[PDB]
Ligand binder design. Sequence first.
Ligand SMILES: [Mg+2]
Length: 142
Amino acid sequence: NFNRFTQRAKKAIDLAFESAKSLGHNIVGSEHILLGLLREEEGIAAKVLSKVGFTEAYLEGKIVDMEGKGEEISEDIVLSPRSKQILELSGMFANKLKTNYIGTEHILLAIIQEGEGIANKILNYAGVNDRTLAQLTIDMMG
Ligand SMILES: [Mg+2]
């Protein structure tokens, strides 16, 4: 009942929304959360994604290839059910690990665990789904 995101995780989610808006997408999907995690730069998830080889430009391009893009949106937009499930799962992972704060690493763990959705399609297309998981797992050791 006291589940809470770290500041970096909150920033990543804000960036996910900002990315969707930029692309004229009114629904924030797993792909936007993934791009938000990369754009956040500082957290484990960004360091994992960059280590396995993604750039912001690549992810954005793939999102556009798959979904298209429309004019920028200025009003409020919303999380898809899968995005909501991913965020709920990130809390579940943090509680399983008995950690107080849901970080970027927990959100990326949850994206991978969820297994479906555009973010996983992009990881799979790039051939780095299991490599991303491995890198995330070692980056969470200590
Ligand atoms: Mg964090």
